[PDB]
Amino acid sequence: GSHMSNISLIVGLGNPGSEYAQTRHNAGFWFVEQLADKYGITLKNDPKFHGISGRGNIEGHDVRLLLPMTYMNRSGQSVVPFSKFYQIAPEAILIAHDELDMNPGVIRLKTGGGHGGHNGLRDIVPHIGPNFHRLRIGIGHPGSKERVSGHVLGKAPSNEQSLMDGAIDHALSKVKLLVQGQVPQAMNQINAYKPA
């Protein structure tokens, strides 16, 4: 299984299908797909765990990657059995997700806490508890609770997309620290990111 707070499972949250791939609620997918490309980790079909998953070496550590294909609000139907099967404790999991409460171009690493209204995290925390790490990728908030659907299921304008893309790229460069267990340093260096 996992070992200490070396990160050994990186999950990206999102919805399946081309109609959702460019939407804000897929920010976690964007990060994990880009991470998989950086390190040459194949993301392959994983019907057993209702997802797409991979395994490979990141900086000398054996790491698994997971994209649930459940739809966002059923994400725990993938993450929970996968993490349990591979004996991965929450403390060794990083979940990348869109964050309504932060601006586009802001990105933070958080350990613990609740779902903050995120319907994918809501499906996960009841099962494994809160003590996993999160890569919170700012997407902004549309105002009212009404509008949250269109917001997250929208395609950001180009300036916001650029801001998010630069923050995601920055975070990719800090995964080495995370797989090495250097969570405090990673948190400082991720949270310090500015777009300009």
Is 20 annotated in a binding site? The answer is yes
CA–CA gap between residue 6 and residue 18 (Å, rounded):
33
Q: In Å, how far from its chain's centre is CA 133? A: 9
Is 188 annotated in a binding site? The answer is no
The pair of three-digit structure tokens given for residue 90, joined into one six-digit string: 């929450």
Q: What is the DSSP string of 115-164?
A: -TT-HHHHTTHHHH-S-SEEEEEE----SSSTTHHHHHTSPPPHHHHHHH
Specify burial of residue 24 (Cβ count, 10 A radius: 0-12, 13-18, 19+). buried
The experimental method is X-ray
Is 86 annotated in a binding site? The answer is no
Is 119 annotated in a binding site? The answer is yes
Place of tokens 């090495």: 180
Residues 6+ apart with CB under 8 A from 76: 123, 124, 126, 127, 128
Q: What is the resolution of this structure in A?
A: 1.0
What pairs with residue 68 in β-bridges?
A: 51
CA–CA gap between residue 49 and residue 55 (Å, rounded):
14
Residue-level length of the chain: 196
The pair of three-digit structure tokens given for residue 131, joined into one six-digit string: 């003590």
Q: Catalytic annotation on 3?
A: no
4 closest CA partner among 104, 88, 114, 110: 88
Integer angstrom CA distances of residue 34 from 27, 42, 114: 11, 11, 26
CA–CA gap between residue 179 and residue 57 (Å, rounded):
10
Q: What is the DSSP string of 25-36?
A: GGHHHHHHHHHH
Integer angstrom CA distances of residue 100 from 4, 141, 147, 152: 30, 5, 12, 8
Write down the catalytic residue from 3, 25, 127, 151: 25
Q: In Å, how far from its chain's centre is CA 64? A: 13
Residues 6+ apart with CB under 8 A from 156: 24, 104, 139, 164
Do residues 42 and 27 lie in contact, with contact meaning Cβ atoms separated by under 8 Å?
Answer: no
β-strand pairing of 61-68 with 51-58: antiparallel
CA–CA gap between residue 125 and residue 122 (Å, rounded):
6
Domain boundaries, the chain: 1-196
